Amino acid sequence: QLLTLKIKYPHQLDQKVLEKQLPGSMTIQKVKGLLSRLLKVPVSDLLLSYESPKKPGREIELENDLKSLQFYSVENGDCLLVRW
Ligand SMILES: [Pr+3]
Ligand SMILES: [Pr+3]
Ligand SMILES: [Pr+3]
Numbered sequence: 001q002l003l004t005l006k007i008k009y010p011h012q013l014d015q016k017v018l019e020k021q022l023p024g025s026m027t028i029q030k031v032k033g034l035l036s037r038l039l040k041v042p043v044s045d046l047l048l049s050y051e052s053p054k055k056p057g058r059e060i061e062l063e064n065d066l067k068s069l070q071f072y073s074v075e076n077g078d079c080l081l082v083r084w
Contacts, residue, residue: 001023001024001025001070002021002022002023002024003021003022003023003024003069003074003075003076003078004019004020004021004076004077005019005020005021005022005050005074005076005077005078005079005080006018006019006077006078006079006080007019007020007079007080007082008079008080008081008082009082009083010081010083017079020034020080022069023069024068024069024070024074025068025069025070026068026069027065027066027067027068028048028062028063028064028065028066028067028068028069028072029043029065029066031048031062031069031080032046032048032065035048035082039082039084041084045084046082046083046084047061047082047083047084048061048062048080048081048082048083049061049062049080049081049083050062050072050074050078050079050080050081051078051079051081052075052078052079053077053078059081060072062074062080
């Protein structure tokens with residue numbers, strides 16, 4: 001299953017968020033790898049969380065690099081929040 005996710009950085013307006021299509025089976029390590037190469041920020045520095053429109057405003061940390069997006073129940077249309 002492919003997830004279409006919004007990608008938000010802290011300084012961005014909600015109106016200017018990016019999107020990416022990612023497999024749900026992708027590990028958090030590999031999502032950080034992708035973001036690291038895009039942003040030129042080290043993998044070790046990235047902090048990822050997500051939010052669902054089902055529970056507006058609640059952030060869930062994507063903490064365990066070995067686990068997948070699916071493990072955390074990230075769904076189509078959710079928003080990945082990226083900090084460093
Ligand atoms: Pr908000
Ligand atoms: Pr927010
Ligand atoms: Pr700082």
